[PDB]
Design a protein around this ligand. Structure first.
Ligand SMILES: NC(=O)c1ccc[n+]([C@@H]2O[C@H](COP(=O)([O-])OP(=O)(O)OC[C@H]3O[C@@H](n4cnc5c(N)ncnc54)[C@H](OP(=O)(O)O)[C@@H]3O)[C@@H](O)[C@H]2O)c1
Length: 310
């Protein structure tokens, strides 16, 4: 009816699929753009059964993008790091069509306009910054989502719950705080803020007070849940920094990211600004799945591990 029509790029993605599902669950007409040479016919078939409109095509098809933009109201990009600057193709189409009410570029991580990282990672987040600067210069309505850590992704990475090993690797001292959110919730909240006037042209941060923790605390709570103790093996900060300088690319990128999130504590190293919007405070009918609930999920029905593309 009056629900804004949402177009999602990278919808078959690791985080993108939760945005597609959240969109449909909220009653929004949902368009999913996907490459012709897909390996997700089963995933696309699921979206289709849920009401999604599938549009196959390449980002290089400028005319197709423009005609597609004219049919929707909101555009959300969940593309991967290798495709960050390819978002300029999306932006060009948005500018030509001229009817888009809100554009959310592919951020969904650290708040790159207030944090810095080691060269391997810094170079990549500068690409996201370039997208934001272009959006602002063109006066395109937007919302920048700092989702912080994808919870299933990093619980799997840090705890390797599917590994019966007796040791656990700790990065740095393990004392740095970080916030992590369940992917399913990042998906739903992103759709909500994309049409919330309170988020128009603002930075939105997902930092629920129940999802702030340190590596050491996460391990301790996990040990209690499963009744096992691990031998904590620390990897010195100086060691991690050296690796980012010697190891090749993309091998050194994940190392740089681990330093950013778990040693420097970039997701918790700042205080909110006047115009910042913390999403957990927005909807009284909704709440972010907490860390305790997340650990319970890994005990009962753990989601598969994942590895981002670099
Ligand atoms: N905060 C965190 O913890 C965290 C963790 C991981 C990722 N991220 C962020 O989340 C965002 C998305 O990451 P992701 O892991 O979800 O992405 P992804 O699943 O790797 O990729 C998303 C989609 O990109 C499309 N795609 C892939 N290669 C392409 C190409 N060459 N040309 C055009 N389209 C292509 C694919 O869709 P089709 O096959 O349908 O074309 C794919 O499903 C990024 O901004 C990333 O940095 C954050």
């Amino acid at each position: 009816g009056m629900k804004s029509k949402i177009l999602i790029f990278g919808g078959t993605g690791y985080i993108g699929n939760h945005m597609v599902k959240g969109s449909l669950k909220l009653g929004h007409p949902t368009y999913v753009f996907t490459r012709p040479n897909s390996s997700k016919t089963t995933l696309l078939d699921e979206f289709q059964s849920l009401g999604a409109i599938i549009v196959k095509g390449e980002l290089d098809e400028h005319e197709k993008l423009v005609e597609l933009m004219k049919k929707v109201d909101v555009v959300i990009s969940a593309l991967a790091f290798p495709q960050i600057l390819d978002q300029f193709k999306i932006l060009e189409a948005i500018k030509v069509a001229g009817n888009i009410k809100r554009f959310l570029p592919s951020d969904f991580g650290v708040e790159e306009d207030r944090i810095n990282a080691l060269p391997p990672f810094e170079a990549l987040i500068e690409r996201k910054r370039m997208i934001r600067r272009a959006i602002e210069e063109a006066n395109i309505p937007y919302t920048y989502v700092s989702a912080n850590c994808f919870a299933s992704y990093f619980i799997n990475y840090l705890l390797r719950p599917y590994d019966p090993k007796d040791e656990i690797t700790v990065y740095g001292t393990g004392e740095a705080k970080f916030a992590m959110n369940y992917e399913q919730d990042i998906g739903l909240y992103t759709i909500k803020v994309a049409t919330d006037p309170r988020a128009l042209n603002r930075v939105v941060i997902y930092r629920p007070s129940t999802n702030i923790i340190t590596q050491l605390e996460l391990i301790s709570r996990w040990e209690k849940k499963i009744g096992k103790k691990f031998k904590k093996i620390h990897v010195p900060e100086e060691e991690i920094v050296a690796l980012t300088k010697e190891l090749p690319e993309p091998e050194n990128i994940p190392i740089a990211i681990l330093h950013c999130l778990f040693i420097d504590g970039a997701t918790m190293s700042y205080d909110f600004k006047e115009n910042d919007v913390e999403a957990s405070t927005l909807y009284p009918e909704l709440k972010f799945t907490t860390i305790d609930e997340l650990l319970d999920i890994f005990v009962h029905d753990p989601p598969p591990p994942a590895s981002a593309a670099f």
